[PDB]
Amino acid sequence: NLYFQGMIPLEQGIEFLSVNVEEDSPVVGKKLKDLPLPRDSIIAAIVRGGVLVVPRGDTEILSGDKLYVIVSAEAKETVEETLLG
Amino acid sequence: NLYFQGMIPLEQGIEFLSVNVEEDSPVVGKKLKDLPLPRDSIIAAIVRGGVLVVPRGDTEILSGDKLYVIVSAEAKETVEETLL
């Protein structure tokens, strides 16, 4: 199947992006509620084996997950570094 | 000031869309936790007066809000009907 990968602008100063979680990403095995994310960032959705996972605080991020993120321009690089290193 | 409006596919069977909340919207003043939504749907973000609002269960939708939604193909019409 075709799929979204990369980033698109939503508004003045807000972007939508995808993150592919690799085996060595620092977020692997962490629960969403325990991630030190900037206040202007959102883990909007997880796609896992092609299936939508609705994120909740107790959701554990796994190797191979695809994350969809909404984030301010100011916070984008910090969120990416938090997720991927 | 350019902006996203409409819908795009993300994956097979998953769509990303925007909704503009008007004064006649059935969901005005409702908390997100109280909205009747199908399993495969997510209120991904709110933009309010140009500012990002992180959706929480107790977040109230206001007239004029812009919602960004992630939904399965199968759930999309149901979500649009609930919100609009």
Q: Output the 3-class SS for B8-21.
A: EEEECCEEEEEEEC
User: How many residues are recorded in chain B?
Assistant: 84
Q: Rounded to the nearest 5°, which phi and psi values hold at A69?
A: -125, 135
Neighbours of B19 (CB within 10 A): 20
Give me the residue label for tokens 């100011």: A74
| Stated resolution in angstroms | 1.5
Where in the sequence is the domain holding A79, given as residue range(s)?
Answer: 1-85
CB within 8 Å: A52 and B72: yes
Q: Which of A9, A13, A70 sits opposite B45 (nearest CB)?
A: A70
Tell me which chain A residues have a C-beta less than 8 angstroms from the C-beta of B11: 1, 3-4, 47, 50, 52
Residue B78: partners with Cβ closer than 8 Å, 6 or more residues away: B37, B38, B41
> How deeply is A16 buried, as exposed, middle or buried, from its count of CB atoms within 10 A (0-12, 13-18, 19+)?
buried
Residue A26: partners with Cβ closer than 8 Å, 6 or more residues away: A82, A83, A84, A85
Give the residue on A whose Cα is nearest the Cα of B57.
A56
Judge whether B29 is closer than 8 Å to chain A, CB to CB. no
Q: What is the tally of structural domains in chain A?
A: 1
Instruction: Measure B30 CA to nearest chain A CA, in Å.
Output: 20
Sign for the pseudo-dihedral over CA of A16, A83, A47, A32: negative
Give me the residue label for tokens 């199947």: A1
Q: Are A34 and A13 in contact (CB under 8 A)?
A: no
B73 conformational bin, left if phi > 0, alpha if psi -120 to 50, beta if neither: alpha
Q: Which of B12, B65, B11, B23 is nearest to B43 (CA)?
A: B65
Q: Please, which experimental method was used?
A: X-ray
The helix or strand, by DSSP H or E, that contains position B42, with its residue range, turns out to be strand B41-48
Neighbours of A24 (CB within 10 A): 9
The helix or strand, by DSSP H or E, that contains position A72, with its residue range, turns out to be strand A66-72
- CATH (domain of B40): 3.30.70.1450
Give me the residue label for tokens 């299936």: A51
Find the farthest-apart pair of alpha carbons in chain A and give their distance in angstroms, rounded: 34
